[PDB]
Amino acid sequence: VDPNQYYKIRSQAIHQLKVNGEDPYPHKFHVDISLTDFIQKYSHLQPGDHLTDITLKVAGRIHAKRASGGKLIFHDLRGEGVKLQVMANSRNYKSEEEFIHINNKLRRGDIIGVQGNPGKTKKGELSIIPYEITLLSPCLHMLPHGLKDKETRYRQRYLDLILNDFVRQKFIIRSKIITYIRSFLDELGFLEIETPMMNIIPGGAVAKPFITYHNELDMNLYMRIAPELYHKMLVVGGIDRVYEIGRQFRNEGIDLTHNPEFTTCEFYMAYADYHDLMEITEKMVSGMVKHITGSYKVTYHPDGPEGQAYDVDFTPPFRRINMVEELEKALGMKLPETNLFETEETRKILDDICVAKAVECPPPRTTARLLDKLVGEFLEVTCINPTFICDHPQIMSPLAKWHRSKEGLTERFELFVMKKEICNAYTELNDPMRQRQLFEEQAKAKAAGDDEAMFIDENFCTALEYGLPPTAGWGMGIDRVAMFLTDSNNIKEVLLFPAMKP
Amino acid sequence: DPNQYYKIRSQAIHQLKVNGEDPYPHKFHVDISLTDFIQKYSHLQPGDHLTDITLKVAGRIHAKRASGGKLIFHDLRGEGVKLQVMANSRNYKSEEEFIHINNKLRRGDIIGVQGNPGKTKKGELSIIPYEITLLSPCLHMLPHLKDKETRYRQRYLDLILNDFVRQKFIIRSKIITYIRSFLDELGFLEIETPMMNIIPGGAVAKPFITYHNELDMNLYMRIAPELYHKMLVVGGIDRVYEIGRQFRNEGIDLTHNPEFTTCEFYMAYADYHDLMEITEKMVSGMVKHITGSYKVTYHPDGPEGQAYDVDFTPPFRRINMVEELEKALGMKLPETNLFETEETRKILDDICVAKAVECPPPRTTARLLDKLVGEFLEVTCINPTFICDHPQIMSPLAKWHRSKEGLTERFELFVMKKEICNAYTELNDPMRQRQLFEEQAKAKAAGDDEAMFIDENFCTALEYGLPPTAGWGMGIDRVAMFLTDSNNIKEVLLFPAMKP
Ligand SMILES: NCCCC[C@H](N)C(=O)NS(=O)(=O)OC[C@H]1O[C@@H](n2cnc3c(N)ncnc32)[C@H](O)[C@@H]1O
Ligand SMILES: NCCCC[C@H](N)C(=O)NS(=O)(=O)OC[C@H]1O[C@@H](n2cnc3c(N)ncnc32)[C@H](O)[C@@H]1O
C-alpha cells in the first residue's frame, strides 16, 4: 500500500516474468481501430447487445479495474482523451484458466491490448467483450488516487496528461493557435524561414542573453533573444514577406508570464507601416479566437476559478490608446514634452514620480526602465479587452522608426489582452545612420551597468546601408496567446515542460 | 573606388535629409506587385501606352541606362521578377522634377513608381512613370557574386544578385510545410519541448553548456528532443511531432552545422517496420510533390562532373549493417552477441588499421564500427537506402532486436551518400534502459565526450509505462541539400555558421 513498497513489489514481479519468458514488454501489438473510432462506430448499439460477428483489437491504459466476482472483471480503458469499458467475462475469454492468469497480472495503469467483440451492458455502457488481453507495458508505480499539486503536475507532465483531461485540451488549443498563424501568414504570401539561434552578438530586443562556447571554432556565442535583425536583412535581400515561429532565450527570472525559453511569431512586411499591422493584427487575433473558440467572446478569470469572471470581446476594431497621453491622464499631471524624453532632467522627473507613486524600479533607473514600470502600473492593468498602446518614446524603442509627426516618439504599438502584453510591432527603422546612433547610445548604457542594453551590431548597420525598403515588423508571444485562450494566469499551464527550480 | 562611393553617396543622402527631401519616407502605397503587373499586362503590343491606367509599384533598381537627356531606363527587380521603367521626360509630372529625381537615383536604390503600363517599340513590357519616389538608397556599390565566403557572410547580397538562392530557400520551406501537412493528416500533434535541459539526451553528441543566472544553474542546449517526446507518449499523446532546432558542439563540414533543424515524431503501437513504410510514402511523395517527378539529378562532383538520376519510387533498398559490412570488407565479423567483448574491439581496431580507416580516440567498438560503416556502406548509398539492425552497442535508446541477439530494431535512411533519417522501435523496458545508461556513463568517463548522461527522470517516466512505440528523426537541412542538388549544407542555411 506504500508507494515505495508498491514499486518494489511490482518491479520484482515484472522481473520474474522476464526470467520466466513471459515478455512483459512485447515488441508489437496490431491495433485495428482507435478508441475514438470504436466509440463512434458502435455507439448506436442497444443495451444488452453483443456483436458476435465482429472482432477488433484496441489498446489503452487501465484507469480502473473493478471485480464483479471471480468470473467478471471491468477494465476502464482510456486513451485519445476518451474512455472505453472492457467487460472481461470468463465465459467469453479464450479459456477460464487464462482468464484468471491475465487478470491476476494486471494492475491499474498498465498498458494493454484487447481483442474482442463490441457490446453494450444492460445499463447501456458501450464495451468490448474480450477473447484475449495482452499486457503491453506495465506501470511499476502507484498512480494518484487525483493530481492537483501544481509542482508535481509540472515536474511529471506525463502524470498530469494521464490524470487530467483538461491539460490535453490546453495543448491542443496551443497547437491550433500556431497552425492558425501559419495558415494566415502563408495565405498572405509570407515565406516561413529559419534564422540563427546562436549569435556572435545577440540583438533585436532588450534582454539579458545566455552565453555558450563553440570548441571547434574557439568562439563565444549567445543564444538569440529575438530574430528581428536577421529578418530585416532578408527584406534587404529581396524577400518582402518573411515570418518565423521559434524559440527565444532570455536569461531572466521566471514568473507568471515569463519562462527563460519561449515561443514567438515574428513577421516583416515590406511597404507596410504600423497602421497596416494594427489592421492585420485585429483580423488575425479576432479570427483566431473565433475559429478556435467559436465566438468572439472569451471568459477571463483574473483571480482563479473562485473569483470574478469577465467577458472579453475580441470583435474588431480594438481600442487604441497613446502611451504618453494616457500615462499623463493616469498620473493626473503633465509630463515633459516628448522631444525632451532623452534628457537627464526628464529621467530625474520620472525617477521622482516613481518614488512618489510607490512604483518600484530596480537599478539601473533609466528613463526606459522607469517608463516601463509606470506603464505596467497605470496602463497595463486596465487592458482587459484587446488594446493597442501606441507611439512609444524613442528612448524605449532603439529599433523603431521615428514618428512622422510626434517628435521624440515612434511608430510603435503593443497589443495587451487580459493585462498581458501579446504583440510588439512597429514601422522598422531603415535609416542606417540613425540606427547606428541609437546603437551607440545603447552601448553607453550597457557599459554603465545595463545588462539588457543592446550591443552595437555593425554587420546589421552595414546591411541597412544597402537599402531596407520601408517595412513594418511584428512579434507575438505564442505562450501568452495560449494563456488567454485557455483562461490561464500562469504560463506553466501552456508549456509542456516549464522551467523549474531544482 | 568602393569606399569613396560610400562616402560620397553618404554625404549626398545626408544632404537630402538636411534639405528636407525625406530620403527614407515612412509609407509608400503599392497598388500591385511586379508579378501581378506582368501577368495582367501580358497582352500589350509594341508602342502601347495605357494613359488611362495609373498604378503604383516598387522594387530595387538593378540597372540604370541613359539614352538621351529625356529618356532613362530603370531595370526594377523584386520577387525574383523584373520590370522595365521607361522614364520619359514628356510623360513625367514635370521636366524639372524629371531631372531632379534621376540625378538622385543610383543602382541599388529602392524606389516607388507611379505610372502607366506600356510596351517599348522593341516589345518590352514597361511602366511609363509620372512620379518616381526614392524609398531607400543603397549607399554601397553592388557587384557588377560568386565568392562563396561573401555569399554566406552577406546573404542579402547573395539574394539580391542570384535568383537561384531564393529558389533553394523556397524549396526548403516547401519541405517543412509538406511534412507538417503529412503528419497532421495522420493525427500527429505538433508539440514544443525544452531546448534548455539540465541533462542533455536523446543522441550521441557533444552539447553546448550555458548558465542561468537567476537560478544559479548550469544548462545544456538540447541535442535532440527524443526523451521529452517519449514522456509525452507515456502521458497519453500517442502521436507527437516537433520540427525544431538541435544544438551539437561539433565541427563544421559539408553536412554539419552546429545548429540544424530536425523533424522528430513518435507514434505509439508502431514498430520500425511500420516506420519504414511511412518513410517511403513521405519521402517519395515529398520529392514528387515539390519537384514534379520521382527522379532527382545528383551532381556529387559539381556541375562539371558525373550526374546520376536517383529514383525515389518505393520501395527503398534495405540492407543489414553487419551482413553488408562483412560483404563490403570481404571478411567475417564476430558474432553479434560478442560485440561487447574486448576481443571484438581489438578485432575491429585491427580492421580499421589494415583498411586505413581512421578513428580518433577513444577507439571504442561503437566508434570503430561507425567509421567502418561510413567508409564501406554509406558511400555506396546513392539511391534511397535503409541500413538496418544496428548493434545495441551503438543504439543505447533502441529496443533490442526480437530475433537477432546483440542487434536492435533500428534503421537509418541514406540518400546521395548522406544520412537522412534515424529511427527505431523505442526501448520501453526501464530497467534495461537504465543499464544502457550506466554503460554510456562508463564510456563518458573513459574519454567519449559524446556518450549519454544517465537520465533518471526519463527512466522514472518509463516505469509508469511507455506503450510499444517507434520513433523517427529526419535532418531537414540534409533533405533540402539533396532536393536542391547542393553538396554543401551552407547552401540551404540562410546564415550558416562561419569562422570570424
Ligand atoms: N520589429 C518589431 C518588433 C518585433 C518583435 C521584437 N523583436 C521583440 O522581441 N519584441 S518582445 O516584446 O521583446 O518579445 C516579443 C513577444 O514575446 C513575449 N514574451 C516576451 N518575453 C517573454 C518571456 N520571458 N516569457 C514568455 N513570453 C515572453 C511577449 O509577448 C512579446 O510581446
Ligand atoms: N527515437 C528514434 C530516433 C529519433 C532521432 C534521434 N533522437 C536522433 O537525434 N538521430 S540523429 O542521427 O542523431 O539526428 C537526426 C538527423 O539530423 C541530421 N543531422 C544530424 N546532425 C547534424 C548536424 N550537425 N548538422 C546538420 N544536420 C545534422 C541528420 O540527418 C540525422 O539523421
From Swiss-Prot, chain A:
Binding site residues for ATP: R250, N251, E252, H258, N259, E421, I422, G477, I478, D479, R480
Q: What is the effect of changing F190V?
A: In DEAPLE; reduces interaction with AIMP2. Reduces tRNA-lysine aminoacylation
User: Which amino acids does the record list as binding substrate?
Assistant: G204, E228, E266, Y268, N424, E428
**Intrachain S-S bonds:** none
Per the record, its GO cellular-component terms are: aminoacyl-tRNA synthetase multienzyme complex; cytoplasm; cytosol; extracellular space; mitochondrial matrix; mitochondrion; nucleoplasm; nucleus
GO biological process, any: basophil activation involved in immune response
Q: What is its EC number?
A: 2.7.7.-, 6.1.1.6
UniProt's post-translational modification comment states: Phosphorylated on a serine residue after mast cell stimulation with immunoglobulin E (IgE).
Impact reported for D273R: Induces protein aggregation. Releases from the subunit complex
State what inhibits or activates this protein. Up-regulated by DARS and EEF1A1, but not by AIMP2.
Q: What is the effect of changing L35H?
A: In CMTRIB; severely affects enzyme activity
Catalyses which reaction? Answer: tRNA(Lys) + L-lysine + ATP = L-lysyl-tRNA(Lys) + AMP + diphosphate
* Keywords assigned: Acetylation, Aminoacyl-tRNA synthetase, ATP-binding, Cell membrane, Charcot-Marie-Tooth disease, Cytoplasm, Deafness, Disease variant, Host-virus interaction, Intellectual disability, Ligase, Membrane, Mitochondrion, Neurodegeneration, Neuropathy, Non-syndromic deafness, Nucleotide-binding, Nucleus, Phosphoprotein, Protein biosynthesis, Secreted, Transferase
Which residues, renumbered to this chain, carry the PTM N6-acetyllysine? K18, K71
Q: Name one GO molecular function term.
A: lysine-tRNA ligase activity
Q: Indicate the impact reported for S137D.
A: Phosphomimetic mutant that strongly enhances translocation into the nucleus and production of diadenosine tetraphosphate (Ap4A). Almost complete loss of tRNA ligase activity
Q: Which residues carry this modification: Phosphoserine?
A: S137
The record gives the effect of mutating E452K as: In LEPID; uncertain significance
Per the similarity annotation, which family is this?
Answer: Belongs to the class-II aminoacyl-tRNA synthetase family.
Extra information: Shares a bidirectional promoter with TERF2IP/RAP1.
Q: How does it assemble?
A: Homodimer and tetradimer. Part of the multisynthetase complex (MSC), a multisubunit complex that groups tRNA ligases for Arg (RARS), Asp (DARS), Gln (QARS), Ile (IARS), Leu (LARS), Lys (KARS), Met (MARS) the bifunctional ligase for Glu and Pro (EPRS) and the auxiliary subunits AIMP1/p43, AIMP2/p38 and EEF1E1/p18. Interacts with AIMP2 (via N-terminus) and MITF. Interacts with TARSL2.
Query: Function, please?
Result: Catalyzes the specific attachment of an amino acid to its cognate tRNA in a 2 step reaction: the amino acid (AA) is first activated by ATP to form AA-AMP and then transferred to the acceptor end of the tRNA. When secreted, acts as a signaling molecule that induces immune response through the activation of monocyte/macrophages. Catalyzes the synthesis of the signaling molecule diadenosine tetraphosphate (Ap4A), and thereby mediates disruption of the complex between HINT1 and MITF and the concomitant activation of MITF transcriptional activity.
* Protein name stated in the entry: Lysine--tRNA ligase
Q: Which organism is it from?
A: Homo sapiens (Human)
